[PDB]
Amino acid sequence: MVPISPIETVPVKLKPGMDGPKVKQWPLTEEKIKALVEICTEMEKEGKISKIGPENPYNTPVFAIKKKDSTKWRKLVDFRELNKRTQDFWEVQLGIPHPAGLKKKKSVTVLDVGDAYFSVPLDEDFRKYTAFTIPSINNETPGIRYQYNVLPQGWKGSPAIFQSSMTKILEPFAAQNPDIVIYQYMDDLYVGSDLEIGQHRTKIEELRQHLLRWGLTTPDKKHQKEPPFLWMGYELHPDKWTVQPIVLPEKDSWTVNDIQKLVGKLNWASQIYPGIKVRQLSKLLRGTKALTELTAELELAENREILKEPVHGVYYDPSKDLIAEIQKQGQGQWTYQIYQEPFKNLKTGKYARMRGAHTNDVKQLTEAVQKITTESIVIWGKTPKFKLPIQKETWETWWTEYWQATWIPEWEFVNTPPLVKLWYQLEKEPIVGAETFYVDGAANRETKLGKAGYVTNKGRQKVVPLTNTTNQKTELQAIYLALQDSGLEVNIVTDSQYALGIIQAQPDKSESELVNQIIEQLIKKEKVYLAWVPAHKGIGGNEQVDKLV
Amino acid sequence: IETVPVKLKPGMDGPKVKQWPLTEEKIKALVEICTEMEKEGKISKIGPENPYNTPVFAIKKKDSTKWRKLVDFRELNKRTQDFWIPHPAGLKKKKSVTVLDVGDAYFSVPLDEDFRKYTAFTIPSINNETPGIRYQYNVLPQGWKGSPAIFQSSMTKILEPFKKQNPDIVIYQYMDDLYVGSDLEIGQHRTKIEELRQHLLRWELHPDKWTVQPIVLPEKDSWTVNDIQKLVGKLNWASQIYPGIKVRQLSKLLRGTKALTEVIPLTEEAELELAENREILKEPVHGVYYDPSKDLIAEIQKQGQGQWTYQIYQEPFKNLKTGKYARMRGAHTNDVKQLTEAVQKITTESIVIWGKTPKFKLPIQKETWETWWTEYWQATWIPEWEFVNTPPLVKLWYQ
Ligand SMILES: C=CC(=O)Nc1cccc(CCOc2cc(Cl)ccc2Oc2cc(Cl)cc(C#N)c2)c1
C-alpha cells in the first residue's frame, strides 16, 4: 500500500445569516427507495458518503431517475436550497477557449477524469449540510440518513473547488516538463507537444502516474477519444478546425423562439463562415419578449447556401504576423477575417452598427476595429495588423478634424470596394463670393403647423408653409431649402443648435429622411460654410418673423 | 508591526470586478512581478473560496524600461471604510513642487489578516487556456485608499526631522505619491530633493499664472459680418458667466441680410459696448467657491493640432480652474495618447489644488477609450470618467 498524498480541503461557509437547508424528503415508490438504498450502500462503502445520526437537522431531497437500459436507476440529489444558501465562489471558467487560439502540436492527447468530484474531499465542517434522507418502506421505520464526505455533484462549490485542486496537483508536473503543454477545462485535460509520438505517449503515462499519487483516475486504456475531437460544438482536426454542423429549422410559420434560436445559430456559424448576417431576423425580434408571435428572406436563404459548403479554420502559429481584414457589407453590417496566411483564416466574423439615430462609415469601421482588437487580445494576446478599405488620406482628414478623439492601431489600405469615404466636408471659414442664406423655421406646438425659409444677401427669398411638423423639423427644412436653391458654393446662417449639432457630427446616413436629403444636397455642393448665431438677439437676416407668421 | 483594524463600510460587500484582457507581454510582465512578490511575502496565492476580485494591469513609467504593476482599486476604495489632514493650501501657491513615489514603503507594513480577502486580483490567461493566477495582498497594497491613511503615522515620524530642518518646504501625500513644494526657485531644490531622497532611504511642476484663464475678445481694425456674428455668439455665452454683458449695439450692426465676408464699420456706440464687455471679463467671476462636500467636474475639448482645453468646476459656469495643454510629447499621431496624458496632468493639478480627483467628461467614444487608455497611463492613481457623445458648440469659445 503506497501512500496517497492528501488533497487539502477548501474551506467553505454559507451566505451570512442563513442557518442551512431544512427541506422535507419527497415521497418515493418502494422500487425507487430500494434502488437508492443499493446505490448509497455501495457509495458508503466507497467512502463517498457516511451514515449520520439523528443529531443532524439539515436535509436535502433525493430522487431516483431510471434509464430504461439495464433497468438501471441513478440517484439524483437536489441541493437547490443549499446552493442558494452556500457562499459565493470565485468566477470559474467564464468563457471557453477559442479554437483559433490553439497552437499546433505534433501529438495531442485528451484525458477525461472519472468520478472527479468524488475523488476530491469535502471540508468536514460543511458535510453536515449535505445531508439527505432515504424514505423507509411503508414509512414504518425511520428513514436512513446520510451525509457526503466528498464534493457532491450538482453542488455550487464542486466545480470551483475541483478545478483549484486539479491545478495545484498539475503545477509541479508542468514545470518539470516544459516541452508539454497542458490545458485545464472542467473534467478534462488536454496535453499537447511537438514531441515524437513515442516520447509523447511516455510523458502521458508519467502524468497519469503523477495523478495516481494524489489518487486521480485517468484513462489508461487507449483513450476512447481520438482525433477528430468534438468539443463544445467544434470539430477539431490535427491541422484544421471547424464548427460542428449547424441545424437551421425549416417551418412555413416561424415562432419567435425559432428566430431567437436561428439568430444565435447563425452567429455561431459566423466565426468560421464568411458573409453570415442575422440583421433582418433580429429586427423582427425587437419589441417582442414573448415566445409565441419576412421581407430579408433572400439573405436568409443565401445563408443556407453559404452554410452548405464546408469551411475550416487553421491553428495559430506565433511566429507569423496576425492579420485582420474588414469589409463593408452594407446596411450597417461589417464582415471580417483574421488570418496569418492568405486564404487560410483562423477565424471570421461580423459587426453590426450600434443603435443610433445618425451615423457614418468611418465611425463604424472604427468601432469594428475596437471589437476585433479586444477579441484578438482575448484569443491570441496581441493586436492584429489591419487591412482596411479606407484611404490613408481619408482617415487622416477624418481624425484630424473630428471633434472627438479617435485612434486605429497599425493598419494599411486594401483596395477592395466599396471604399469608406468622407462624403462631404464643411468649410472652416466663410466663402468669398458665395451667396449668404439666412435660414429659419418655426412651428406651433398646438396646431403642429409651421414655416421654413430663407432670405439672402442678393434679395433671394422663400417661405414654405408646412402641415405636420415641429420646431426641429422646420429648422432642418430651412437649411434643406437653402441648399436646394443655392449655387455650388454657399454660406448658410442658422440659429438652430439642433441642426448644427446634427451636421457637426458629420452623418452620411440617417433615420430621418429630412437629414438624408440634406446629406444628398451637401454631397453635391463644392463648398458649404455653416455658421451659427444666437436667436432673438436681433442678428440681421434672422427672420424669425417670416417663419413665425 | 501590529496590523491595524480595518473593515468595509456598513452594508457593503467586497469588490467583485471583472478582469479585462491583457496582451501576452503584459501577462508575462505580471507573472514575473507577482512570482517575486510571493517570495518576498507581499502576496500569497489563494483559492476559489475567495469570490472577490479587483482588476490589475501593467504599465511602463517614464525614465524606465521595466514593467510596473497597477491595481485598479477604485471599487475597493469607494467600498472601503472611510478613514478618520486638511489639504495644504500652500502647495498650490508654492513656486515649484516635486512628486515622489513612496509606494515601496507600504510593503513593509502588514495588512489586517481579515481584510486581505478584499484585495484579491487575478493574472489572466490567454484564450482562457489555464485558469487565472489568483493572489491576495499580505501587506498594504499600492493604490488603496487605506494605505496612505494607515502609514500616515510612520511617514509623519520619517519626515519630522526634515520638516524641522526646512520649515518653508511644503509636504503633501496623495495615494502612493509625495508632493514636496518650495518657494526656493533654486536648482539646488533638485539637490535638496536628493536630500529628501536619501533621508527617505535612511528609514517638476510650477503653478499656472491664472487659476481661470480670462475670456478674450478679438481686437480688430476692420470687422466682417462673420466676425461680428462670432463675437455676438461668444458674448451671449459669456453672459451666462458674467452679469452685465450686453450684445444690443453689436447686433444692430448685423441689421440687414448682409453677405458674410462684407466688412462692417463699427459705430461709436458699438465700440463702447465692446469695451464695457472687455472690462467685465477682466474682473474675476463673482462668488466662486470650492465646497469639499461636492464632486469636481472636468470637461476637456480637443481643439486640433495637439491643443486641448479644459475647465474644472462644481457648478456650471462657476469654474474653479481652466487651462490649456499642448505637447511635443510622443503623441502627435495618436489622439488617445494625448487625451490620456491630458487627463493625467489635469488630475495631478487637481491633487495639488484640492487633494482630490475630478470626474472627467471625455470627448471620446467609450469603446475607443476603454480599449486603449491603459497603453499610455503612467500614474499610480486612476480618476473617474464618463463620455460625451454630442459635440459641444462651446469648443470655439474656449479657443
Ligand atoms: C494526431 C494529432 C492530433 O490530434 N493533433 C491535434 C489535434 C487537435 C488540435 C491540435 C492543436 C491544438 O490542440 C492543443 C494544443 C495545445 Cl498547445 C494543447 C492542447 C491541445 O489540445 C486541445 C486543446 C483544447 Cl482547448 C481542447 C481540446 C479538446 N477536445 C484539445 C493538435
Q: What residue type is assigned to position B349 of the chain?
A: E
Q: Taking a contact as any Cβ pair under 8 Å apart, which residues of chain A between 315 and 344 contact chain B? A: none
d(CA B106, CA B203) in angstroms, rounded, equals: 13
Rg of chain A on CA atoms, in Å: 34
Q: Which atom of ligand 1 is nearest to the CA of A104?
A: 11
For cell 486640433, the residue is B304
Report the chain A residue with the minimal C-alpha distance to residue B300. Answer: A404
Q: For residue A268, give the C-alpha cell.
A: 455561431
Q: HSE (CB half, 13 Å, CA atoms) of A156? A: 23
d(CA A232, CA A235) in angstroms, rounded, equals: 9
Nearest to B278 by CA among B222, B238, B221, B223: B238
Nearest to A388 by CA among A431, A426, A419: A419
Structural domain containing residue B377: 291-398
| Helices and strands in chain B, H and E counts | 12, 15
Decide if B146 contacts B9 (C-beta within 8 A): no
Same domain, A396 and A509: no
Task: Kindly write down the DSSP assignment for every residue of B363-393, as one continuous string.
Answer: SS-HHHHHHHGGGT---S---EEEE--S--T
Q: Does B339 touch chain A (CB under 8 A)?
A: yes
d(CA B393, CA B399) in angstroms, rounded, equals: 12
Q: For residue A496, give the C-alpha cell.
A: 438652430
**Which one of A105, A184, A230, A240 would you pick to mutate in the ligand 1 pocket, going by the greatest count of ligand atoms within 8 A of its CB?**
A105
DSSP B127: G
Q: Which residues contact A544 (CB under 8 A, 6 or more apart)?
A: A440, A442, A535, A536
Same domain, A495 and A547: yes
Same domain, B275 and B338: no
Residues of A in contact with B45 (CB under 8 A): none
CATH number, domain with residue A321:
3.30.70.270
Same domain, A295 and A431: no
Same domain, B284 and B197: no
Nearest to A15 by CA among A115, A114, A83, A95: A83
d(CA A488, CA A522) in angstroms, rounded, equals: 10
**For residue B297, which phi and psi values (nearest 5 degrees)?**
-115, 130
Same domain, A359 and A410: yes
| Residue A97 in contact with ligand 1 by CB distance below 6 A | yes
Same domain, A509 and A489: yes
**For residue A370, which phi and psi values (nearest 5 degrees)?**
-65, -40
Same domain, A134 and A208: no
Decide if B219 contacts A507 (C-beta within 8 A): no
Strand segments, DSSP code E, in A128-180 are 132-134, 144-148
Same domain, A305 and A376: no
CATH number, domain with residue B192:
3.30.70.270
Decide if B215 contacts B238 (C-beta within 8 A): yes
Q: HSE (CB half, 13 Å, CA atoms) of B5? A: 0
- Give the Cα-Cα-Cα angle A315, A319, A321 (nearest 5 degrees): 85
d(CA A31, CA A137) in angstroms, rounded, equals: 9
Same domain, B127 and B237: no
CATH number, domain with residue A511:
3.30.420.10
Q: Which residues contact A135 (CB under 8 A, 6 or more apart)?
A: A25, A27, A28, A33, A143
DSSP A390: B
d(CA A247, CA A244) in angstroms, rounded, equals: 10
B119: three-class secondary structure by DSSP: helix
| Residue A101 in contact with ligand 1 by CB distance below 6 A | no
Same domain, B32 and B169: no
Number of other residues whose CB lies within 10 A of the CB of residue B215: 21
- Give the Cα-Cα-Cα angle B249, B255, B260 (nearest 5 degrees): 110
Which method was used? X-ray
Nearest to B320 by CA among B213, B174, B173: B213
Q: Does A397 touch chain B (CB under 8 A)?
A: no
Same domain, A76 and A65: yes
d(CA B47, CA B117) in angstroms, rounded, equals: 10
Strand partners, B223: B264
Same domain, A218 and A109: yes
Same domain, B370 and B306: yes
Same domain, B198 and B217: no
Structural domain containing residue A153: 3-92+118-158
d(CA A59, CA A117) in angstroms, rounded, equals: 21
Smallest CA–CA distance, residue A456 to chain B, in Å, is 6
CATH number, domain with residue A80:
3.10.10.10
d(CA A451, CA B65) in angstroms, rounded, equals: 65
Domain count, chain A: 5
**For residue B325, which phi and psi values (nearest 5 degrees)?**
-125, 125
**What long-range pairs does B187-196 form, CB within 8 A, spacing at least 24?**
B189/B96, B189/B98, B190/B98, B192/B166, B193/B98, B193/B100, B195/B162, B196/B100, B196/B162
**For residue B332, which phi and psi values (nearest 5 degrees)?**
-60, -40
Same domain, A339 and A432: no
Same domain, B96 and B196: yes
Q: For residue A321, give the C-alpha cell.
A: 504576423
Same domain, B9 and B136: yes
d(CA B387, CA B365) in angstroms, rounded, equals: 6
CATH number, domain with residue B124:
3.10.10.10
Same domain, B295 and B282: no
Q: For residue A40, give the C-alpha cell.
A: 448509497
Which ranges of chain B would DSSP assign to H, the alpha helix? Answer: 24-39, 74-79, 89-93, 103-106, 146-165, 188-202, 225-241, 248-253, 268-282, 335-354, 366-372, 395-398
Q: Which residues contact A352 (CB under 8 A, 6 or more apart)?
A: A279, A332, A333, A334
Same domain, A12 and A126: yes
| Residue A227 in contact with ligand 1 by CB distance below 6 A | yes
Backbone dihedral region for residue B375 (phi beyond 0: left; psi -120 to 50: alpha; all else: beta) = alpha
**For residue B60, which phi and psi values (nearest 5 degrees)?**
-120, 110
d(CA B331, CA B114) in angstroms, rounded, equals: 44
Same domain, A441 and A381: no
Smallest CA–CA distance, residue A98 to chain B, in Å, is 6
CA distances from A448 to A188, A478, A495, B72, B101 (A): 68, 16, 20, 53, 64
Task: Kindly write down the DSSP assignment for every residue of A429-477, as one continuous string.
Answer: SPPTTSEEEEEEEEE-TTT--EEEEEEETTS-EEEEEESS--HHHHHHH
Nearest to A367 by CA among B55, B305, B360, B364: B364
Same domain, B101 and B178: yes
User: What does chain A come to in residues?
Assistant: 549
Q: HSE (CB half, 13 Å, CA atoms) of B312? A: 27
Domain count, chain B: 4
Q: For residue A142, give the C-alpha cell.
A: 425511520
Nearest to B46 by CA among B138, B147, B139, B144: B138
Same domain, B145 and B23: yes
Nearest to A26 by CA among A172, A133, A168: A133
Decide if A223 contacts A208 (C-beta within 8 A): no
Of A263, A288, A316, which residue is a domain's last?
A316
- Give the Cα-Cα-Cα angle B175, B181, B184 (nearest 5 degrees): 165
Longest dimension (CA), chain B: 81
Task: Kindly write down the DSSP assignment for every residue of B282-311, as one continuous string.
Answer: HSPPSS----TTS--EEEEEEEETTEEEEE
d(CA B253, CA B265) in angstroms, rounded, equals: 8
Of A196, A227, A258, which residue is a domain's last?
A227
Q: For residue B369, give the C-alpha cell.
A: 477609450
Of B290, B310, B327, which residue is a domain's last?
B290
A27 alpha carbon, distance to own chain's centre: 43
Q: Taking a contact as any Cβ pair under 8 Å apart, which residues of chain B between 55 and 84 contact chain A? A: none
Q: Which residues contact A214 (CB under 8 A, 6 or more apart)?
A: A4, A5, A7, A169
Decide if A469 contacts A450 (C-beta within 8 A): yes
- A112 marked as binding residue: yes
Of B241, B262, B290, which residue is a domain's last?
B290
Of A261, A296, A316, which residue is a domain's last?
A316
d(CA A373, CA B143) in angstroms, rounded, equals: 28
Give this entry's resolution in angstroms. Answer: 2.4
Sign of CA dihedral A487, A488, A493, A499: positive
